[PDB]
């Protein structure tokens, strides 16, 4: 019944569509097909007390395929910055993604995540990352194939959305 719009802003080819599909219905797809623009994959979730809708508004990473960056963030209720633990460039512009994200929507709970815990965790970026420290940014590490914390970001967002830290699927 309640609809909660969130947003992915993962730079580069770091997994976002694989993530959303694997959560929507299916399994991991190896083939790289960069999304041009935004495709909402409605994703509802049942809870121990209630039911939550998370219309993931996946967005494009690369420049040329942007279309409308900052265009679809309006009327958001959360967001999931992203970057892969295997790439180095996907981190050094997380501050830029954050400034572009928190500007249009004010201080919505954002969970800086990390994909593919399987390959090499904290490989080229740094063995530790100091961006989530002071702000309202809950870090994590998930996987779209291994399916590791693959309910934890959405659990965190639901908890911080309804308020009760007791919600569970």
């Amino acid at each position: 019944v309640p609809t909660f719009k969130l947003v992915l802003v993962g730079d580069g080819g770091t997994g976002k569509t694989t993530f959303v599909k694997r959560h929507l219905t299916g399994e991991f797809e190896k083939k790289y097909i960069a999304t041009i623009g935004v495709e909402v994959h409605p994703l509802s979730f049942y809870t121990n007390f209630g039911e939550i809708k998370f219309d993931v508004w996946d967005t494009a990473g690369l420049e040329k395929f942007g279309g409308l960056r900052d265009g679809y963030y309006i009327n958001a209720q959360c967001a999931i910055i992203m970057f892969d633990v295997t790439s180095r460039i996907t981190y050094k512009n997380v501050p830029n993604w954050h400034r572009d994200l928190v500007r249009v929507c004010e201080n919505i709970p954002i969970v800086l995540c990390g994909n593919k815990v399987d390959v090499k965790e904290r490989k080229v970026k740094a063995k530790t990352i100091t961006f989530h420290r002071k702000k309202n940014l809950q870090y994590y590490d998930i996987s779209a194939k291994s399916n590791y914390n693959f309910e934890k970001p959405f659990l965190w967002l639901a908890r911080k959305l309804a308020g009760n830290p007791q919600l569970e699927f």
Partner: protein, 683 residues
């Protein structure tokens, strides 16, 4: 009119209408009347604010795309001067009396415009008027200034900094009209400009030159005038000022040398007063966290500059006391940890991602210890003794919150065990280690004040094993093993598991494991029974402790392998996805495979499940599982005796062969690659 319906489509989820509206945007933009429409839609009140933000952000795109034929992102329909002079006087009419969203969006747009038109110099003083006109109006100009000064390149910076920075100091010093928040944002603007200008001076000099460098002195004195003030009591404002002072210290130390001897005492007073306030208002509770983190970052930076290094060492024994004063567990954290043991295992871990005052203080302590090992050890000894004395004093009076100082003292003394225990080895201090363990650690194992103290005491006895009597060792181990039981709360159980890790490491390195020998079966039984209660994060620790326990003594494992092997295999199956679970399983099997007495049963119990995993379809078993199975097989075969078993050659070899043959997953082929490569190691 119809100009706005498209934007509603841009906000809509349905793919078709969104694509249609996006193409409408891409096609109508070429008309010069676009920007004026965007402005008249975003500035006009009485409208869906979402549409306002949409128009403003699309206007940002416009200014980036059809304003400068020289920009790397130019589009054919360049903007006519008429629409330019129209919006340029119609756009700034926002920034006023609205929700911060649309104001910040209009500010984004203005900064985009102003990013181009500062050299051509249209009137850039309308916002300057809003500085003195009262509130919502000023917040708009402040956001404009922030965005602009973040946008200016290295070229404009030596020109715009000597213009903004004087007016910035004007705004800051004037504390009568400009509220706290506006002054804080002015400070942030100064810090941004200084950081970027020092970056430029690093790239191409010109910053510390005849330019703003004196204004740096002006602002330094302005800062050192601010911290004393309790109005303007906003703690976050003090946080911004302190962050700015850290910027000054780290960027150009040479200018800070003269006045820093005056800045240090007020920082010290802030630290002490904030320690008292925190202990009162958050620890014993029936943006300040950001302030504390700022003070700690300042101390960190102060430790960096070589000339400023000896400045902290002189007052080190007076700092570690307040550090330890900060490491107390807060009531909110006690509630959370009691309500969610997963969070207790994630946070108190020593490679965490959470960041609470406790963790920051712990980092500060580890740093100032690893930098001044001898001095820091002596200072930690003295301050721990002083804390012990004050704790005993307030204990005689029976204070309801006396133990939290014991927890923090134990944590500080353990988390740096190396330097302190080494200094005690040569007696460079006069801290009674035996007295510490007896009267402090062991004596508190018998109380009934709170579980977390019991657990911290268990975890603390772990570090100082190299200095304790054998009877003390037996006492501590007997208490710890009793800690894995179900009668105790989960937190003390988890801490006891960590203590068992510490024992199995230290005693083994100490080559004295025959003291742990009579405790193994109880230890392993408790570990096993724990792992079957809690699911993920507790397991991620239990399995590692189990690996170390196996490493303790091979004979015991050879006796009780019939327990380790089935549990480890069942867990590696049910919880195969996790990476650290897989690595821990592989480590168990590796350490287990050294025991030649375990060969038979381990192979007989594992190889069937391994091959059955290999045979299964790639789309039926959970993903990544085949890879971990292959790696486990590699470890088994490589880390075993040269003569191979009949089970491997008859099943493992053809199974992995056909697996590598018919597979297509890159990871599968890769890991199987080393598998077959390791198989060639046959003699």
């Amino acid at each position: 009119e119809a100009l706005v319906d498209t934007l509603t489509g841009i906000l809509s989820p349905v793919q078709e209408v969104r694509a249609a509206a996006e193409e409408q945007i891409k096609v109508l933009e070429v008309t010069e009347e676009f920007g004026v429409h965007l402005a008249e839609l975003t500035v006009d009140p009485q409208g869906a604010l979402a549409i306002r933000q949409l128009a403003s952000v699309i206007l940002k795109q416009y200014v980036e795309t059809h304003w400068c034929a020289q920009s790397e992102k130019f589009r054919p329909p360049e903007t006519t001067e008429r629409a330019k002079i129209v919006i340029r006087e119609l756009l700034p009419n926002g920034l006023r009396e609205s929700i911060s969203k649309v104001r910040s969006s209009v500010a984004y747009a203005v900064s985009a415009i102003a990013h181009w038109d500062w050299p051509e110099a249209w009137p850039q003083l309308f916002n300057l008027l809003m500085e003195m006109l009262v509130l919502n109006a000023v917040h708009g100009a402040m956001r404009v200034l922030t965005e602009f000064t973040r946008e200016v390149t290295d070229t404009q910076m030596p020109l715009v900094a000597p213009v903004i920075l004087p007016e910035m100091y004007k705004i800051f010093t004037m504390a009568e009209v400009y509220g706290i928040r506006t002054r804080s944002r002015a400070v942030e603007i100064f810090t941004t400009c200084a950081h970027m200008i020092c970056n430029m001076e690093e790239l191409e000099k010109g910053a510390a030159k005849v330019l703003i460098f004196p204004v740096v002195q002006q602002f330094t004195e302005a800062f050192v005038q601010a911290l004393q003030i309790p109005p303007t009591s906003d703690s976050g404002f003090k946080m911004e000022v302190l962050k700015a002072v850290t910027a000054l210290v780290k960027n150009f130390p040479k200018h800070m040398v003269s006045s820093m001897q005056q800045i240090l005492p007020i920082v010290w007073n802030t630290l002490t007063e904030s320690a008292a306030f925190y202990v009162r208002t958050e620890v014993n509770y029936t943006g300040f966290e950001n302030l504390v983190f700022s003070i700690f970052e300042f101390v960190h930076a102060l430790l960096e500059n070589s000339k400023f290094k000896s400045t902290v060492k002189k007052a080190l024994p007076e700092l570690i006391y307040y550090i330890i004063l900060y490491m107390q567990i807060t009531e909110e954290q006690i509630k959370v940890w009691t309500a969610n043991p997963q969070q207790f295992v994630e946070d108190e871990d020593d490679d965490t991602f959470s960041y609470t005052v406790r963790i920051a203080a712990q980092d500060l302590l580890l740093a100032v210890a690893t930098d001044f090992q001898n001095e820091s050890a002596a200072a930690l000894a003295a301050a721990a003794t002083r804390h012990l004395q004050e704790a005993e004093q307030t204990k005689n009076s029976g204070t309801e919150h006396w133990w939290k100082i014991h927890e923090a003292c134990m944590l500080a003394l353990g988390s740096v065990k190396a330097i302190i225990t080494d200094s005690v080895k040569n007696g460079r201090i006069h801290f009674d280690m035996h007295g510490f363990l007896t009267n402090v650690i062991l004596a508190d194992l018998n109380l009934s004040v709170s579980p977390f103290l019991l657990g911290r005491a268990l975890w603390a006895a772990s570090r100082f094993t190299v200095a304790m009597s054998p009877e003390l060792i037996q006492q501590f181990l007997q208490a710890t093993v009793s800690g894995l039981h179900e009668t105790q709360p989960p937190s003390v159980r988890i801490s006891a598991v960590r203590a068992i890790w510490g024992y199995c490491d230290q005693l083994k390195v100490s080559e004295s494991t025959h003291v742990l020998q009579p405790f193994l079966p109880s230890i392993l039984d408790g570990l096993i029974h724990l792992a079957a209660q809690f699911s993920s994060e507790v397991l991620n620790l239990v399995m590692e402790t189990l690996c170390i326990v196996c490493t303790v003594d091979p004979e015991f494992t050879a006796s009780m392998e019939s327990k380790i092997c089935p549990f480890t295999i069942a867990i590696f199956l049910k919880y195969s996805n996790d990476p650290v679970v897989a690595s821990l399983a592989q480590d168990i099997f590796k350490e287990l495979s050294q025991i030649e007495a375990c060969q038979g049963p381990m192979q007989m119990r594992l190889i069937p499940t391994l091959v059955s995993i290999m045979q299964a379809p790639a789309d039926k078993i959970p993903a990544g599982l085949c890879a971990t199975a292959i790696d486990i097989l590699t470890t088994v075969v490589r880390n075993t005796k040269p003569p191979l078993s009949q089970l491997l050659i008859c099943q493992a070899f053809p199974a992995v062969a056909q697996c590598t043959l018919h597979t297509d997953d890159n990871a599968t082929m890769q890991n199987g690659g080393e598998c077959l490569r390791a198989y060639v190691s046959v003699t």
